[model samples]
Target chain A: SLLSVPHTESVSLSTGSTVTIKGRPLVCFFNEPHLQVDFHTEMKEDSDIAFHFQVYFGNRVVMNSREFKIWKEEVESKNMPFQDGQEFELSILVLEDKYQVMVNGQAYYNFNHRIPVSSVKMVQVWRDISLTKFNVSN
Target chain B: SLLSVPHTESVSLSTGSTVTIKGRPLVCFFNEPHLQVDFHTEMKEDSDIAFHFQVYFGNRVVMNSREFKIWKEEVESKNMPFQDGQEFELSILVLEDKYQVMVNGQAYYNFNHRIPVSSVKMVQVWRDISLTKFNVSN
Candidate 1:
């Protein structure tokens, strides 16, 4: 519903929680627009992140976690399912051990949990995108 | 005056043109909040960049240019003058052959012209910061 970029919302995530986002990049993929989703353990901006997902549109995706104020090892994927200059549907389904990521209704990648899903208290979606919808469901 | 994040403004830039931005990171340095300023050859978001300046806050600064939809070599510097969780004043002064960057009143870095300053028609300041003042002078 025309959500703003750099959006932040308090959330409660569990093993069955799912996040669905619908958005479009603000610029063309060739211009290297970026999209980032951060699931934070605390409501504060500098709080630890349980799931840090970043997409360099048309390039790559990086998934990582931050614990004790330090970043853990990154997980990189080159599965560029996102089309250039087009809207996309992104879904993250929380499982007991991993988060399954789907792009445009296709299974894209899975990120194993570095931090427990129960610790997530906030979700932030930001950078280079015009968000139309963001939903959290159990 | 408080300007929104992800701000874009069209302008004329030539040799001796200066851009000054005063802003603060939305998160602490350890959280890796980013700041990006792009000097574009056109008003459009997908236009070629005459100069691309980015800061990984406490980590490093990267500079580059995009011409004909391809990004050129990046210039990286670790000379960060920004303090953690504090406000910053950034200045970019266009010279004939290079753009001189100043952070918090310190000469931080220089990026040689891969694209001429005269071609810069728009300037964008974006990402992970709250901008308070932006000024352009010739």
Candidate 2:
């Protein structure tokens, strides 16, 4: 079913909704002046979140959250390819060692998978943008 | 840069507009009574088609374009997961043998690759359908 993700709203993934990421990628699209969203993964059966991926406006594009905290010390580079009021895509891929990140089809960076990816029962998207597409696959 | 797809519009992918199947899925959403579209791959340097992923709308839910030509022999079945006036996602993935087809994150089928994947100069979408997102990776 299609999800209606309003501006400044959160799409809940901690519920019964489960999107498979077995053989394909999980992509999210946002449209706004500047996109700011947080990608949090919670264990399907518990609340223990080892890490999370967060995105903000301007050059501080990606953040890798550990200990439920994020700051400049835990962020990625200034090579973000987003523009003001334009649309952008952020893709998250599951690899053996890390989760590869891409922006507009270019290699952005890879965030390390601190915990078992399979334990991530829910992948939630939240705040400050119009999510046009959120797709997962089997 | 990435392009936000509007209803009944086309996104140019001819000049290095490469989309990756790395970790996210590329979803095509259809929200109407019937949906039809054409996915073409042209020879990098010439006018040859590697193959086509053509979709024609009919009185049913789904059809497989296996025989290379769709329409007359148009197939339909209960196996299709699409619902009228409801949005659905179709994912296309590149493989050594064929293009993996998925509907709403489920494995639907494989579309055969008749030509070299490298020879695909352009991937164009046309005709009825309101596409919300077109994502790629590098």
Candidate 3:
């Protein structure tokens, strides 16, 4: 059942596949000067792997990122199997021309039409995720 | 002019713009999960506006978000101007994504990518942003 594990936690998944959050559970905070979520991410599989994500807040569905900018491509994993089962981080930020994504420990995708960063909220982690902490601020 | 304002009041720029902070300011609690610092903004300007942000933790630069993604067109927003920024909330979720923005109460941007989230320490805000309020959460 979905109770023995957790709504969110750090663990391992079987190979040749992935684990993901169907709805959006990720979120961030911003003061009112000017800023949002942004980054660059890449796959770690052999030929191609899928990176899925959803957005939701207490019964309110926010934005499903993968709907418009789904990124699946070849990534160099140094020939290692998925083993880091620590709580991973999933967030966003601001950019100049477009948007950039960084996943695991590498820079991967970038988009141009994904600007106007105004509406975004809760975020969730999926397959190959191991984030168990949140860095609030100084 | 830039040094004598109370903690809970923010100076606004226009009708479609506003800047405020959470009623109280508590020292950040950095334990395990993530310590994030972000800027929630709203922009109703019809012209192509350029804004910037910087986060310094007592003189130590922890996080720096810029317009490089815009330069590459990775995030769309060149001629958009963001629907007049009537009222909005933008943020940065620590862990994975870069910036998670909520505009006019809508989720707009997800700067999700492949960057080392554990290395971030401080955060800062820049100019031309319609400010809102300050906040803190667990």
Candidate 4:
């Protein structure tokens, strides 16, 4: 409920920057029912995302190539675990083997290392989401 | 989410006020989580709640004082669908049978007729929670 610092709605994910969240630390799930996460190869350079994950209001999830004309494949998760406009907290642990996604204190999804996550210079969230605390843990 | 009004941090649920929330709304799911919804028989009259629906964040739920205690004979349910801070949209339709709880764009949880819900002049939210849109429905 109370934090040492006030809750933040967003964070900057620089290279090697890690996002840490706790059980009680309040955070927003997404901007709306439709939420998108863009993984970029370079910050402010390409102006496009390499891999994009989208969650729809109806709980349909998709992992697609933003540069589909040049890129090869796409992924989709048919799990409708997330609801529209419902405040939720999830942790995306960038592990060596995979990107572990946990929602509401439970293991919801685990996105494996389809590509080198380290090459990802940024992980940006867009639409229908606000984060309370956005800080790189040292 | 574009709030019709500047997002409200707290609401005054005095009486005759219905909180209509759309989009991901933030609220606490108890860490060692347990949620208690108390239906007061007489508002601000007695310390004891008339009818209470207490939800265990894990699996079990209690409704009345049957197996619990004389001072606390509570009802219990094992349907634990809500995750802490998980996006949820629930509206209490004050109808004849009970205060029907419609959650996440679906019909769910009908707290059936026992106490006259109208006598219960107030509804309150507690534990891990934050509400942005709280007002009457037109």
Global fold similarity of model 4 (TM-score): 0.38
The better-scoring model by lDDT among 1 and 2 is 1
Strongest candidate by lDDT: 1
Please compute and give the TM-score of the first chain of candidate 3 against the native first chain. 0.30
Error of 3 at A14 (Å): 78
By TM-score, the better pick of 2 and 3 is 2
Can you tell me which runs of candidate 3 are displaced by over 4 Å? A1-138, B1-74, B78-81, B93-98
RMSD of each: 2.2, 18.6, 19.9, 13.0
* DockQ each: 0.49, 0.01, 0.01, 0.02
Best by TM-score: 1
Per residue, candidate 1 scores C-alpha lDDT tens digits across B15-125 of: 888899999987668667788899999998889998899999889999999999888898899998899989889988888889999987777899989887788899999
Enumerate residue pairs that collide in model 2: A25-B23, A25-B24, A25-B25, A26-B23, A26-B24, A105-B137, A105-B138, B19-B136, B19-B137, B20-B137
Please, what are the lDDT tens digits per residue for candidate 4 over residues A18-66?
4544322122232112445556555542334455666654546776544
User: In candidate 4 chain A, what residue range of length 10 has the lowest lDDT sum?
Assistant: A23-32
State the C-alpha RMSD over the true interface residues for candidate 2, after superposing those residues: 14.9
Chain A only TM-scores, each candidate in turn: 0.97, 0.62, 0.30, 0.63
Least accurate 10 contiguous residues by lDDT in model 2 chain B: B22-31
Chain B TM-score against the true chain B, each candidate: 0.96, 0.55, 0.36, 0.59
DockQ of candidate model 1: 0.49
Per-residue alpha-carbon lDDT of candidate 2 for residues B9-98, written as tens digits (9 for 90 to 100): 222333233332211112222111233333334322123334334332323344333223222233344455554444556666666677
Local distance difference test values of all predictions, in order: 0.88, 0.42, 0.26, 0.46
- Cα-lDDT of candidate 2: 0.42
